[PDB]
Design a protein around this ligand. Structure first.
Ligand SMILES: *[C@@H]1O[C@H](CO)[C@@H](O[C@@H]2O[C@H](CO)[C@@H](O[C@@H]3O[C@H](CO)[C@@H](O)[C@H](O)[C@@H]3O)[C@H](O)[C@H]2NC(C)=O)[C@H](O)[C@H]1NC(C)=O
Ligand SMILES: *[C@@H]1O[C@H](CO)[C@@H](O[C@@H]2O[C@H](CO)[C@@H](O[C@@H]3O[C@H](CO)[C@@H](O)[C@H](O)[C@@H]3O)[C@H](O)[C@H]2NC(C)=O)[C@H](O)[C@H]1NC(C)=O
Ligand SMILES: *[C@@H]1O[C@H](CO)[C@@H](O[C@@H]2O[C@H](CO)[C@@H](O)[C@H](O)[C@H]2NC(C)=O)[C@H](O)[C@H]1NC(C)=O
Ligand SMILES: *[C@@H]1O[C@H](CO)[C@@H](O[C@@H]2O[C@H](CO)[C@@H](O)[C@H](O)[C@H]2NC(C)=O)[C@H](O)[C@H]1NC(C)=O
Ligand SMILES: *[C@@H]1O[C@H](CO)[C@@H](O[C@@H]2O[C@H](CO)[C@@H](O)[C@H](O)[C@H]2NC(C)=O)[C@H](O)[C@H]1NC(C)=O
Ligand SMILES: *[C@@H]1O[C@H](CO)[C@@H](O[C@@H]2O[C@H](CO)[C@@H](O)[C@H](O)[C@H]2NC(C)=O)[C@H](O)[C@H]1NC(C)=O
Ligand SMILES: *[C@@H]1O[C@H](CO)[C@@H](O[C@@H]2O[C@H](CO)[C@@H](O)[C@H](O)[C@H]2NC(C)=O)[C@H](O)[C@H]1NC(C)=O
Ligand SMILES: *[C@@H]1O[C@H](CO)[C@@H](O)[C@H](O)[C@H]1NC(C)=O
Ligand SMILES: *[C@@H]1O[C@H](CO)[C@@H](O)[C@H](O)[C@H]1NC(C)=O
Ligand SMILES: *[C@@H]1O[C@H](CO)[C@@H](O)[C@H](O)[C@H]1NC(C)=O
Ligand SMILES: *[C@@H]1O[C@H](CO)[C@@H](O)[C@H](O)[C@H]1NC(C)=O
Ligand SMILES: *[C@@H]1O[C@H](CO)[C@@H](O)[C@H](O)[C@H]1NC(C)=O
Lengths: 317, 57, 171, 172, 316, 185, 316, 57
């Protein structure tokens, strides 16, 4: 006479293997994945404002390449550069290209304010057939090619004060010709010089004459430089030749803006975390998609799978 | 009684998980509840669990 | 486990248990039966869900960073950028591995602990009316119908009521 | 806790216990009484103090470092410096959070363990002269005055002295 | 008959909430703070030797700005630059300013030794009104403005050996005038050139003529450059115009010296850890005051509070 | 330990035990003896070897990196390189220290647990024929020769065979006359 | 009529102290060392291909210093630079020396392909007595010293296309004379100019005339520059004076190659991990030998010992 | 003798904490000892604790 009372736990037919401190593989009833290893392959247009350059790099839209004149006065939270982007204007080079790209991307705006620079004794709006705007020649929309007027090239001394409550970004350039004939024909003097200066900074460039490889029909170059003028300071331009003059300034901003190289398409969805492989969910703590991220993203790790146990040890029959 | 109390505390925790943005834990608790609900006996818990499941994705 | 209940003196689990994580199986004069215990299941679920909430807490939001892929050889600055990113990746990988290992070990240990605690509570309830058979089962030395099993499973069991019969059957 | 004593079969704590962390309350023919057990309190305090000394050990001294605030935009090098500092800060914040979490879990578990160990030690002392009531109290089946309670609380309790009376009172 | 013996644990009326692995807020009997989140607002002058710059930056005291003449031959453990600092001499700029500031701060000394540079055929000790020293014009105390003597500027060619057992830091400059008339009236030649070289390094600067913004009445500038000469090596200066010559060298040292930007006032106290917000205690392993620290400091964290449980579960 | 066996109710270890980590010492009518238990020893060794293999798993291989020693003072970039290397070194030192501390604590706790589990298994085996003396020893209340101890040490002990004699020797009222053993046959 | 059955555990006479979370020193039966703190002092020659430079730095062998001629067309996994290394050729300096050294070390090869550059109107294969090849004067094996032919130095304009599927590394130089007489006698024009350009990059260097310290009989210098030409791109050299021309290109590689400064000898053994102190084993996860490592290496830590407990508490 | 031995060992650990520079642990142990002192019954332990409290950076 009597009864038996047994204590026990549950089990499952198919368990899950997980790692522990002691055992490399141990079977539990259930587990969950902590590493996001897949992406949809499309960048969601929300909540972050995405601006696709299509066939334009950021520097081209900044300078004003003709086929990039659609991104004027534009803003963005993430600018996406494609691999198909091309340059279709005057052959140029930017010493410290990465820094200018980074600062413009972190600013997050291409808002351009035009200023009435006073150019006394020079021909304005010079162009070239390698940078066609419409059927005829053209040039960078935010730059002005100053050349000879009459037969003399005056020593230009122009000033522009910063009386606003925000920083100003000025993009200017120096023209490097291919032969002394071109130099003397366009800028009279045999050797030019450009000096862009503030109260605490100076930048003097001497043009260099020589034949470069043929790019879009030209063996001449343009060197692009930038200058930031703070409130209360003054920009001074002193040039005796080969000046690619600015037309105004860019309003510098500070925020959460950035840039990303990616070839994934842009879709209408919502996702906080974007990678070059596409948008990924932010519910898991880690991710193995790409080390390049933007937004509220899981932390990148080398492991493709990490399973966290959500149940007890699975001891079947 | 006891079963109802277990599922009700579970529903409270699911509601908190939904109201905190943690989706993995909400899914964990929802799956466990979807296996503990005595079908034909607690339709109110089933309906409230479906409602909390909607507020997730 | 540290407590020796799960995969210990308990031979194996019950794949039939579907309404709980821990429970009782009984065999008496009226036959056999099974019923889950909701308190220990609630405790285990609370601990597991708490550690889940702690793990998956959204705490990382980054915007403008550094470049991590490069098309041209540059040298010193690129070396430094690559080294920094590699260091960060390695450190976070180590953190994730150690985290999952420690959390899984603790999960197994706490489930073992909950099982052992339920066993200990049932044993203290039964008092001198039953004996531990060593395999997670108690041999009860008195008449215990389905209502008696229910009173044991919900904490209302009164041992002195059956103490005399149990002592008579034991010794 | 892992051991189920504190917030387990022990219903709650004693706010009247001010001279120790764990202790005994007794009820006998002479009345009621309370006295702390100092060995378990000493063990728990030692573990907690060792943890404290390990955590708060001064091990960081840095002098000339890198610049961390900047007044003008520079680009690549400033981006790299900011990224390095942010990475370091995030990693150390994670380390601190995980450290405090693990230490608190271990503290709770070890205090529960000390309570359970004291309970089991008292039970092994009592041998067959008492029964576990399931609520952290032992029912003693013989007359046990204040001197007997003291002999239990200081480890010199002799079970054979009372074994005959206790067995007579236990088995009907 | 019989007795009851009950086991128990203590409890408190008001526990403290802490975080664990399984619970975000659980009540224990007591806990301690591990994050130092407050500062007095003052920098302690001990144990670290604190040198306050007041109105001078480290670079101006290096060059010899007038109102910085007090900072000659000074040493420090932590140099404090204030936000009210201003320049009141010849308008200058330093290419790679950050590196020069950092290396001078890490050296920790402004000990300057004058060397007898022999400038034969030039006018020395030139001054300017934008750098007033007393009743008349002046210049940086550690630099020598060389201009024309008579009507010629020779190719200056001077050598200086380092026969000591330590490194020598030479600070020199290149004058960028504003007009060609200024250039020709000061240095004769139409274009200058400065070349400072060692046995395994060389630096050549070509002046740039042009108008800069008006700073203290002048549109001309000076660019500052440095050169480190190792023991056994030799410094060579070769210039045909616009040379702002060094007057000697600074002795270079290595140690625990650094620099910090702060506006906190200095006070008489002892504190191993300094931040721009002030001196903080180092009893807690972590701190949430400032990521910029100096000395034996708690590590910076983002959390403002982290409570470490020092007691059992509080179960009232 | 958390379980109170090692350095707890068991006074100290046995330097004579050389063929195992846990075991039994017995004293009966035939004399004294000692024998190791291979199940608990194997389990403890298995867990320790698992954590050891997990820790020392070779997972780091790096080639071209950055410069870490410098011959000339340079400033900003060199400051940044030194700061990066110092940060990495400090973080890895913290990781190593915390790892070894946690692992040693866990090893001590799991060995204590294995001892306690062996003790409880033996007690549940002995059932009502023995009593826990509180110092890791069981007082067995029946005749138990070397074969009986061997049956205990390999799990085949049958309690019902000795239960009657064990109860007869256990629950004795020595104070009353005839409270000892029943001499009727 | 009873028996006693006692449970127990083993013990050892001399345990080992380890650290835990709660105790700084506790004795266990066994422990293992996790920090590798000792090295043999020698670099193992396997499995990694170790290239000993003896008396040459990587840059000197790159240029083609005479006593480094044994390093032509060499490959390596780890290049080892010694402290006894010296230069014994034309005194030179490399702007961004560290970056060139790093990129050449990461390429891991000195495989040089000669291209038929056509220099019309200049004298080739110039030499000097500071760069002796045998008893007489010589020059860098990979560089061509171009001077006047007859009495004229034309504007050299040479193009070289990259029609291969790999990158080309070009090393070239610019000679800085010490006097104007030397400049005019070597390159006719009073001031030279060198321009090396691709389709998206360009470099223009203007020579600097002046006296430098006397190194190996000379006060003139050479500045070394490099240019990478991608497949499909074209290298263009346009120079009117002072050009130290390339003789060809180096093939660029990507892989596990690196460089290390060490004075440890090379021995016959197998070890995946090399440090400046020698080869170390990779059995332990951490090491305290040197922060500079190469290969499958233990991670560097500040601790010199970290003991992992492999046994229970030792209670004698 | 038991309470006295406990409090004296407490004072020894406080002295070590002071002689190691760890102030948080010293404050922890000092507060606990000032909570274990049998009010109306002991004064020497109080005086030694006050002396160690004064010697505290
Ligand atoms: C997300 O996109 C990135 C970028 O495309 C992927 O990383 C890169 O993936 C390619 C393969 O599509 C890798 O190239 C392969 O490399 C191996 C090296 O052993 C080589 O054997 C193959 O022939 C091929 O060239 C490339 O290495 C890899 N880059 C990095 C830095 O990992 C990534 O895989 C994508 N992830 C997902 C989840 O889509
Ligand atoms: C307790 O741990 C210690 C380590 O702290 C163990 O001592 C070492 O054990 C290893 C075996 O794993 C011995 O390695 C062998 O050494 C010989 C001679 O060099 C070699 O030819 C073998 O290939 C192997 O590497 C090692 O000598 C020994 N001692 C030391 C100082 O390292 C010990 O075995 C452990 N004891 C137990 C009971 O686990
Ligand atoms: C482990 O838990 C997960 C929790 O997500 C279970 O997955 C869900 O299971 C329910 C079953 O009712 C499905 O409706 C969901 O769609 C599942 N979600 C996902 C993301 O798969 C999973 O079934 C559990 N595993 C075991 C063996 O119990
Ligand atoms: C432990 O408790 C016992 C209680 O039995 C103490 O023994 C008593 O000690 C007091 C004081 O010396 C005597 O007046 C009593 O007569 C003793 N009682 C008995 C039954 O012997 C004992 O002193 C306590 N301490 C120790 C160390 O054993
Ligand atoms: C928690 O610890 C703190 C330690 O500072 C205790 O605060 C001290 O309490 C003692 C005793 O009343 C006082 O002498 C000190 O002046 C207090 N220090 C303070 C307030 O900074 C606190 O009492 C402890 N809490 C509990 C619940 O024990
Ligand atoms: C220490 O001082 C810094 C300023 O140097 C404080 O940083 C400011 O904090 C406020 C409040 O969060 C922000 O609004 C400002 O934008 C911060 N300024 C900068 C430059 O970061 C910081 O809060 C101070 N910390 C303490 C503990 O006093
Ligand atoms: C490995 O070699 C390094 C040198 O590259 C040694 O580091 C030096 O050690 C000495 C002696 O303690 C110090 O005086 C130097 O300041 C150290 N230099 C550096 C750069 O750290 C290191 O001690 C060697 N290690 C072993 C195990 O031999
Ligand atoms: C851009 O915005 C400014 C300010 O609103 C405006 O003056 C200007 O005309 C706009 N367009 C261009 C091309 O600048
Ligand atoms: C350039 O114009 C500004 C503004 O009037 C003036 O201050 C400066 O002297 C001028 N520079 C010249 C004329 O060289
Ligand atoms: C400059 O002085 C040094 C002194 O050693 C001398 O060798 C060199 O020839 C001098 N140069 C000129 C151009 O006088
Ligand atoms: C280097 O190797 C290449 C292999 O293509 C060979 O053509 C060339 O002649 C070699 N150069 C020397 C100097 O041996
Ligand atoms: C140099 O040669 C290239 C070859 O294509 C040619 O295009 C270029 O015009 C030449 N330059 C001069 C100055 O002759």
């Amino acid at each position: 006479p009597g009864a038996t009372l047994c204590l026990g736990h549950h089990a499952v037919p198919n368990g899950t293997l997980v790692k522990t401190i002691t055992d490399d593989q141990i079977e539990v009833t259930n587990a969950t994945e902590l590493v996001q290893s897949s992406s949809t392959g499309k960048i969601c247009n929300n909540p972050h404002r995405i601006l696709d350059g299509i066939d334009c790099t950021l520097i081209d839209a900044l300078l004003g390449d003709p086929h990039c004149d659609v991104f004027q006065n534009e803003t963005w939270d993430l600018f996406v550069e494609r691999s198909k982007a091309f340059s279709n204007c005057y052959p140029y080079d930017v010493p410290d290209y990465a820094s200018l790209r980074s600062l413009v991307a972190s600013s997050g705006t291409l808002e351009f304010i035009t200023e009435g620079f006073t150019w006394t004794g020079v021909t304005q709006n010079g162009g070239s057939n390698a940078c066609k705007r419409g059927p005829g020649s053209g040039f960078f929309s935010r730059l002005n090619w100053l050349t000879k007027s009459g037969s003399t090239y005056p020593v230009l001394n122009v000033t522009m004060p910063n009386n606003d409550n925000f920083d100003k970004l000025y993009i200017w350039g120096v023209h490097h010709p291919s032969t002394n004939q071109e130099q003397t024909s366009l800028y009279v003097q045999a050797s030019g010089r450009v000096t862009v200066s503030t109260r605490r900074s100076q930048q003097t460039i001497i043009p260099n004459i020589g034949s470069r490889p043929w790019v879009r029909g030209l063996s001449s170059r343009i060197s692009i430089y930038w200058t930031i003028v703070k409130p209360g300071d003054v920009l001074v331009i002193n040039s005796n030749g080969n000046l690619i003059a600015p037309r105004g300034y860019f309003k510098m901003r500070t925020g959460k803006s950035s840039i990303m190289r990616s070839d994934a398409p842009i879709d209408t969805c919502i996702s906080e975390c974007i990678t070059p492989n596409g948008s990924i969910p932010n519910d898991k703590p880690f991710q193995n998609v790409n080390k390049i991220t933007y937004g509220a993203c899981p932390k990148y790790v080398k492991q493709n799978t990490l399973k966290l146990a959500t149940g007890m040890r699975n001891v079947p029959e | 009684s006891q079963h109802e109390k277990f599922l009700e505390w579970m529903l409270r925790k699911i509601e908190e998980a939904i109201k905190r943005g943690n989706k993995i834990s909400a899914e964990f608790l929802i799956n466990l509840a979807k296996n503990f609900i005595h079908v034909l006996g607690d339709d109110e818990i089933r309906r409230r669990l479906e409602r909390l499941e909607r507020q997730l994705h | 486990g540290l407590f020796g209940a799960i995969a210990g003196f308990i031979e194996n689990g019950w794949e039939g248990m579907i309404d709980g994580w821990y429970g009782f199986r009984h065999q008496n004069s009226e036959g056999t039966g099974q019923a889950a215990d909701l308190k220990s299941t609630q405790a285990a679920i609370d601990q597991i869900n708490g550690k889940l909430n702690r793990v998956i807490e959204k705490t990382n939001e980054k915007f403008h960073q550094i470049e991590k892929e490069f098309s041209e050889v540059e040298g010193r600055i690129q070396d430094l950028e690559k080294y920094v990113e590699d260091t960060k990746i390695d450190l976070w990988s180590y953190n994730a591995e150690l985290l999952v290992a420690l959390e899984n070990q603790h999960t197994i240990d706490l489930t073992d602990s909950e099982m052992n605690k339920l066993f200990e509570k049932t044993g203290r309830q039964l008092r001198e009316n039953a004996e531990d058979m060593g395999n997670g089962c108690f041999k009860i030395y008195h008449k215990c119908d389905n209502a008696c099993i229910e009173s044991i499973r919900n904490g209302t069991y009164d041992h002195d009521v059956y103490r005399d019969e149990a002592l008579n059957n034991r010794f």
